[PDB]
Amino acid sequence: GYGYYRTVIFSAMFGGYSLYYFNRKTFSFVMPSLVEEIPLDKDDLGFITSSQSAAYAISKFVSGVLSDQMSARWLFSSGLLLVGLVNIFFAWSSTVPVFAALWFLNGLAQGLGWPPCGKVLRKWFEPSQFGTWWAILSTSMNLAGGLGPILATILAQSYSWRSTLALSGALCVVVSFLCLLLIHNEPADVGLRNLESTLQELLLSPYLWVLSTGYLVVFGVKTCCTDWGQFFLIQEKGQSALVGSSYMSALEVGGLVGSIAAGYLSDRAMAKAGLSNYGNPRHGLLLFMMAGMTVSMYLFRVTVTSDSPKLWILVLGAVFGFSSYGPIALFGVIANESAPPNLCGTSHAIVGLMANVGGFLAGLPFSTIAKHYSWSTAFWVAEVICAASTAAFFLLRNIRTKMGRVS
Amino acid sequence: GYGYYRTVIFSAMFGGYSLYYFNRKTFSFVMPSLVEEIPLDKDDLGFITSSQSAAYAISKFVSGVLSDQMSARWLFSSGLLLVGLVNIFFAWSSTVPVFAALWFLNGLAQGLGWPPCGKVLRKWFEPSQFGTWWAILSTSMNLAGGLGPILATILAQSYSWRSTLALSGALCVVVSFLCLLLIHNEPADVGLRNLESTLQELLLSPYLWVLSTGYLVVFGVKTCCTDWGQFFLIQEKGQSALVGSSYMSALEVGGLVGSIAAGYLSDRAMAKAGLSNYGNPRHGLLLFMMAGMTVSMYLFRVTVTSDSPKLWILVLGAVFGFSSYGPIALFGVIANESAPPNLCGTSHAIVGLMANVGGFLAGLPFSTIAKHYSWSTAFWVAEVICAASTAAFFLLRNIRTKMGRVS
């Protein structure tokens, strides 16, 4: 049955990508037991994590381009098998360049997880339900990030880092063998009905780059607020460290509920409409949430003092988390959905490369502006870029969203 | 008397820059008598005019940078003496490379006219009256453009192109000798009271480049509408050639009244305010007029048919001309006004180089988008860029407008 296959393939892909995001950050999760066992440096740890970041940028791009050509089930379970072999070799490693090289290989293999998920969600799930199941699979990412450090500290208190990370890699190998048999990349695999364009017809479509610059701005504003809202509450808003950490936790909880709400309400907006090729019924709430980022960063910049209570801090953290992790889910939804069927993952990779560009823009120039001028000037520049792109995307909401050839 | 010097120096500079803009386009003005006398090609004529355009781009930049170092009266009357010597040599010329080289030298010498006007208006006129006298000197430019072809056709019907252009150059020589003695570049020349920063302190100020990108967008949208609104009414709006030409004349008359209204009402807004260094009281109506460009191009794009009358065409032409030539005057006003006193012309030149960039963007990529997609898609991309920069400049209205050092 078609719904039985939707349930089974998405549950296997749910557990699979939870294992993916758990083993994208396992060295981050079991970091205290490893630095108790063997000594490292701060710059050495940063080199390992930056090697993963560079390899995972390259691998998101290469895996998005390759997921259109080769199948999704083999690319998915081969990525999880490579992650498992990497963690098996990593737990039995002792010297620092072997740590850095194997974690570079894990950065290469973590990219092979999500564009197969994008191809499966593209060919299986209807556009009237694509956003909410996309949001539940990003909730699998968030569930891995939640249950990661807790049970990681449990298994690092019970067993060592070698045993925990080796059993995690062996679990990736087992879930790879048991998720190769439980992903079908199209409904035409089991005999069900499915639901021509080239790459230059995707790249010359303006909606890919409007979507990419909107995702660039939204991810850069998300990343600068996520990385420096703690210091913005410490230094220019007079709040303590507990209020800044609880503001980050409010932004994360609001981000989970905002990703799920963006998916579900954008699928409600897609079911009620969808007769024309120009425009997108997901823009009608993507713009609500980008205006929510505007109103949220304004009411967090000018209406936060040292005397305004923690309730307003938590409310504004939840509303900016809502209004920010919603659009990142929606730019992923549209980069997979408004693309041609054989140019879906390429479109999502070209959009997701702007995550790397915006992460660099929120790391070095945002901290540069916050060091030279002030923190409020830097976060206000972020609010200006986000609100100007909110207005620009409200203008550009009615370009030809369905990409590829024009006929 | 201080007001007597304001009147006399501005009247001499008024007649001077009228002679400047009349002799910037005299070969364009007396073009029919010259093509009756000697034969040319369309690409030859285009090479002459493009040589002037390139030399005048280079000369606006070099003259703006040089007007801060050397005096304004000598640079001004030396520019007018060079224009006069060029036209004296040009009227007595016969061969095509001499035409192109002398008109290149006129392109080099027309740049030497306006940054001395900017320095004189900067040091003489108060910021509570700077915009309206700036607008009257741009009205001198428009008066030269109005009385140019009319009396040019009169003097080309009476005398030849040689006699007319030679008497025009001799009038530039006479007005140069009689305007060197009637421009004082500071009130400290005659003993009146006047009204430290470096170049890297100007270039690293963000308001110069926010102002430059706003002027880039406004001049590109002005230039694409001015160059292609005729064809947009011919081809996609069903209007005849007379309605398109009268729409352009309505945009020009509206542009003159909008430049003067921007200057006068921005000086009224400057007199009523002006206590802080952040923000600019001219932004409060520069944003009204950029929103006027937005509303004007929207109500000209979607509420113009083949059945909507010529009254709505003329009203929308006047309102977009208002709302477009207002801001170009105001970006000049602010590029001269919000700059340091010894970095005024450099700031105006760095802003005015974006006129060259936006003129190229409205020439080749705008016609490229209008050839590939449609005319309404191209003008809608122009409306999107103008409205997105309207919103971005409404955000950025409160950056530190006073440029230079921070103390």
UniProtKB/Swiss-Prot annotation, chains A, B:
Gene Ontology BP annotations: gluconeogenesis; glucose homeostasis; glucose metabolic process; glucose-6-phosphate transport; phosphate ion transmembrane transport
Catalytic activity field: D-glucose 6-phosphate(in) + phosphate(out) = D-glucose 6-phosphate(out) + phosphate(in)
SS bonds (residue pairs): none
Tissues expressed in: Mostly expressed in liver and kidney.
GO cellular component: endoplasmic reticulum; endoplasmic reticulum membrane; membrane
InterPro entries recorded: MFS, MFS_dom, MFS_trans_sf, OPA_Antiporter, Sugar-P_transporter_CS, Sugar_P_transporter
Compartmental location: Endoplasmic reticulum membrane
Superkingdom field: Eukaryota
Pfam families in alphabetical order: MFS_1 (PF07690)
Activity regulation behaviour: Inhibited by vanadate and chlorogenic acid.
Transmembrane found in the keyword field: yes
Effect of R24H: In GSD1B; inactive glucose-6-phosphate transport
Keyword annotations from UniProtKB, A to Z: Antiport, Congenital disorder of glycosylation, Disease variant, Endoplasmic reticulum, Glycogen storage disease, Membrane, Sugar transport, Transmembrane, Transmembrane helix, Transport
Record disease entry: Glycogen storage disease 1B: A metabolic disorder characterized by impairment of terminal steps of glycogenolysis and gluconeogenesis. Patients manifest a wide range of clinical symptoms and biochemical abnormalities, including hypoglycemia, severe hepatomegaly due to excessive accumulation of glycogen, kidney enlargement, growth retardation, lactic acidemia, hyperlipidemia, and hyperuricemia. Glycogen storage disease type 1B patients also present a tendency towards infections associated with neutropenia, relapsing aphthous gingivostomatitis, and inflammatory bowel disease. Glycogen storage disease 1C: A metabolic disorder characterized by impairment of terminal steps of glycogenolysis and gluconeogenesis. Patients manifest a wide range of clinical symptoms and biochemical abnormalities, including hypoglycemia, severe hepatomegaly due to excessive accumulation of glycogen, kidney enlargement, growth retardation, lactic acidemia, hyperlipidemia, and hyperuricemia.
Protein name, as recorded: Glucose-6-phosphate exchanger SLC37A4
Organism: Homo sapiens (Human)
Gene name tied to this protein: SLC37A4
